[PDB]
Structure 1
Amino acid sequence: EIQFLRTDDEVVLQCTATIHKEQQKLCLAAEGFGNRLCFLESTSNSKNVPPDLSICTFVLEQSLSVRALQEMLANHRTLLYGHAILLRHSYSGMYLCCLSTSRSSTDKLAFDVGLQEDTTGEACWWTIHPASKQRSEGEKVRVGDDLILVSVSSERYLHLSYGNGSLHVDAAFQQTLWSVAPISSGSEAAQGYLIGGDVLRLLHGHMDECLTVPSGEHGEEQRRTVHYEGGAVSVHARSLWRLETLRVAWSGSHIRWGQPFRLRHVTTGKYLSLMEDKNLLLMDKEKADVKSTAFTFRSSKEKLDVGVRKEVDGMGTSEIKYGDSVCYIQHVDTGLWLTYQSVDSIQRKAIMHHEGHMDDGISLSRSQHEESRTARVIRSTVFLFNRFIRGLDA
């Protein structure tokens, strides 16, 4: 039974590119604050460079027929080819649109594609059309399909522009095939359980210290080390970690024991990694690979490994529960277990020892959506303001 895309689901629009005779998968991305214009994020080299799907996920608000959309403008449903759909950026909360303003990227008959705050007007609405004759108008849209999107406002296709040296996204009369990948389904999401792509705090077994980086003493290189702190750090944004799965499709699925994932520090935008000297140190996105940045959750420190279980499509089954389940972090390749060094604002350093300590369990707590939004805003604004300061100093 092939499952069908439905409204209120989180999806990512990905297009395949053919730069110098190789196929690399590119996902449509946007950033809420600052640049309204959309861009592309590469997902082919996930083993070498992590993909940032938090800015690529979109939600299917409403699927309406063309005449229903016209009547509404004059004033859980399965998507059908030829319907008018509304896409909201999950992070920003703003909707995709045709900006009606062009960057003049050598295409005079083109419009830039970006995010828009308001839902009124026909700029935000898009029409989905079948790729080939296998599908037809009025048919249900399958999770695995190629789609061409036509803007209602300008009758332009969501187009991948090869003309510029850098790959762009724009509304052009040429058509580009888009494939939809389901990230998560809200209705089938069990409450209180861990889902992929959640910003969360690692509460240590004492229930009063969190895994965090040093405070913002203006030393960016000093921010890289990882340790335990207790007190207000549990309320600050410097102890927020996002669990990113190694898979693009069905990333927002219930996390099972032993499933590899990457832990990203939201404030610094850096991934937790195990250096060869057994000491944890945050790496950059460019050099964050699967070899060092892969981690798993184990129910117990018992050495019988789960072997290999193939990832299953769909939302999956909920195993790890928030606030009560006890988890032990183990590096995938080295097999080391995360523990506190206990060397003596506790500032108790955390290292990985394959034997480990006895109270190495870590509970999981959800950060609020407001807290995650604010932390991402802080990271983006720090980056922009640092660039501005460097330019002014130059």
Structure 2
Amino acid sequence: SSFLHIGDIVSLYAEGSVNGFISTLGLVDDRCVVEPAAGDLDNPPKKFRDCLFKVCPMNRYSAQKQYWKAKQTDVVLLQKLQHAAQMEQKQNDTENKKVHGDVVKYGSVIQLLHMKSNKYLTVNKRLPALLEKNAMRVTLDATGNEGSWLFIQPFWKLRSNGDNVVVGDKVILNPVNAGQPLHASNYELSDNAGCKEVNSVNCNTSWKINLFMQFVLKGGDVVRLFHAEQEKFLTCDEYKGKLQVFLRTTLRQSATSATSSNALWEVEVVHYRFKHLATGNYLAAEENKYCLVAVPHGNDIASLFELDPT
């Protein structure tokens, strides 16, 4: 429990009227719902990166709002409006950079943006909900019009107003502009398997942001294994039309700068297990005397590998 420094990866495994992890299908899917069966707060599910939520300062889009209104509907003042909008955008970027690491001042106004969406989660003020009969729409906006960010309501109601919110403390997404805080879509979603959208209404449950990990060492994290023997890392390539694991012979002098994107490896624990994040398969070894290969997944017991202490 510590002050929620702005900018840290966040996540709200809601445990109100229902329990589930709040996220979206990703890509262009314009809907934010929960996945009760996907995972648990105490039992995090796979694809942990899907929960990446960066905390950013409230967006300022006054000149941006004026420019949008002008675009919707003069020409002479358009250049001045564009210049003012550019200045406002620069100011907004500066403000967002300033709050980096800022403690969660109970009652302060911030926003949470999904890394996959790379946009601020906002609520459609004058828009009905996609499914709920008597609710409003909400999606992820690329930039936002000051409605992207909302207030943090101390659902615990213990931390002092303005106090640095303890990470994991009971909080709710109080609607700054709408006034109706986040409400779990109890609707029995059929189109989306295990779907429970988030609306802007007056409810009695919410979720609290949880800080992510800024990665006898780190466990379930995706890192790269560089073989000091070869002074490089063992990546995977589509050689001869088939996936093959080999040490890349990079023609770049800077060995440490060889971020080929094929060095994606995930580590698991049991009582490590290596998963080839480059192709989504799992590494393994077989006969040649022996050679390394990739299989669909590490579920097979044969996928075991040994890490030796320095």
| Band the TM-score falls in, shorter-chain normalisation | 0.5 to 0.7
The amino acid that maps onto 1:230 is: R
Q: Is the 8 A contact 1:148 1:175 kept in 2?
A: no
**Identity, % of aligned positions:** 19
Q: Counterpart in 1 of 2:212?
A: 183
Distance 1:134 1:230, change over 3 A: closer
The amino acid that maps onto 1:145 is: D
Q: Counterpart in 1 of 2:91?
A: none
CA deviation vs aligned residue, 1:132-187 (integer Å, no higher than 9, x gap): 443453233111312111222322322322222333232231343212221146xx
Consecutive unaligned residues of structure 1, counting only runs of 5 or more, are 247-258, 301-394
**CA apart distance, 1:118:** 1.0
Secondary structure of the 1:54 match is helix
CA deviation vs aligned residue, 1:38-70 (integer Å, no higher than 9, x gap): 3435333997x9521212111222279xxx999
Q: Counterpart in 2 of 1:269?
A: 280
TM-score (norm 2): 0.62
Matched length = 257
More displaced, 140-149 or 127-136? 127-136
Q: Counterpart in 1 of 2:27?
A: 33
CA distance in 1, matches of 2:187, 2:16: 13
Secondary structure of the 1:5 match is coil
Q: Counterpart in 1 of 2:39?
A: 43
Q: Is the 8 A contact 1:7 1:63 kept in 2?
A: no
Distance 1:299 1:135, change over 3 A: same
Q: Which has the higher contact order (CA 8 A, sep 6+)?
A: 2
**CA apart distance, 1:290:** 11
CA distance in 2, matches of 1:12, 1:50: 13
RMSD: 4.5
Q: Counterpart in 2 of 1:157?
A: 181
Q: Is the 8 A contact 1:158 1:175 kept in 2?
A: no
Q: Is the 8 A contact 1:11 1:184 kept in 2?
A: no
Q: Counterpart in 2 of 1:123?
A: 147
Distance 1:124 1:272, change over 3 A: farther
Of 159, 167, 170, the match for 1:143 = 167
CA distance in 2, matches of 1:11, 1:171: 20
**CA apart distance, 1:79:** 0.9
Q: Is the 8 A contact 1:242 1:264 kept in 2?
A: yes
Q: Is the 8 A contact 2:3 2:167 kept in 1?
A: yes
Consecutive unaligned residues of structure 2, counting only runs of 5 or more, are 67-87, 89-100, 252-257
Secondary structure of the 2:49 match is helix
CA distance in 2, matches of 1:90, 1:283: 27
**CA apart distance, 1:213:** 5.6
Residue 195 of structure 2 corresponds to residue 170 of structure 1: no
CA distance in 2, matches of 1:117, 1:85: 16
Q: Is the 8 A contact 1:79 1:140 kept in 2?
A: yes
Greater C-alpha Rg: 2
Q: Counterpart in 2 of 1:210?
A: 234
CA distance in 2, matches of 1:4, 1:11: 13
Q: Is the 8 A contact 2:236 2:246 kept in 1?
A: yes
Listed as ranges, the matches of 1:233-244 within 5 Å are 236-237=260-261, 239-243=262-266
Q: Counterpart in 2 of 1:380?
A: none
Q: Is the 8 A contact 1:241 1:263 kept in 2?
A: no
CA distance in 2, matches of 1:102, 1:8: 31
Distance 1:139 1:31, change over 3 A: same
The amino acid that maps onto 2:174 is: V
**CA apart distance, 1:3:** 1.9
Distance 1:169 1:208, change over 3 A: same
Distance 1:271 1:92, change over 3 A: farther
The amino acid that maps onto 2:229 is: G
Distance 1:16 1:30, change over 3 A: same
The amino acid that maps onto 1:98 is: V
Q: Counterpart in 1 of 2:249?
A: 231
Distance 1:236 1:80, change over 3 A: closer
The amino acid that maps onto 2:28 is: G
TM-score (norm 1): 0.51
CA distance in 2, matches of 1:290, 1:148: 42
Q: Is the 8 A contact 1:144 1:179 kept in 2?
A: yes
CA distance in 2, matches of 1:232, 1:152: 52
Q: Is the 8 A contact 1:159 1:171 kept in 2?
A: yes
CA distance in 2, matches of 1:57, 1:37: 16
CA deviation vs aligned residue, 1:97-131 (integer Å, no higher than 9, x gap): 2255556323331323x322214x22211111111
Q: Is the 8 A contact 2:236 2:278 kept in 1?
A: no
Q: Counterpart in 2 of 1:107?
A: 133
Q: Is the 8 A contact 2:13 2:22 kept in 1?
A: yes
**CA apart distance, 1:95:** 1.9
The amino acid that maps onto 1:28 is: I
CA distance in 1, matches of 2:58, 2:307: 38
Distance 1:28 1:208, change over 3 A: same
Q: Counterpart in 1 of 2:4?
A: 5
Secondary structure of the 2:21 match is strand
Secondary structure of the 1:40 match is strand
CA distance in 1, matches of 2:111, 2:218: 28
**CA apart distance, 1:279:** 8.1
CA distance in 1, matches of 2:147, 2:174: 11
CA distance in 2, matches of 1:137, 1:94: 28
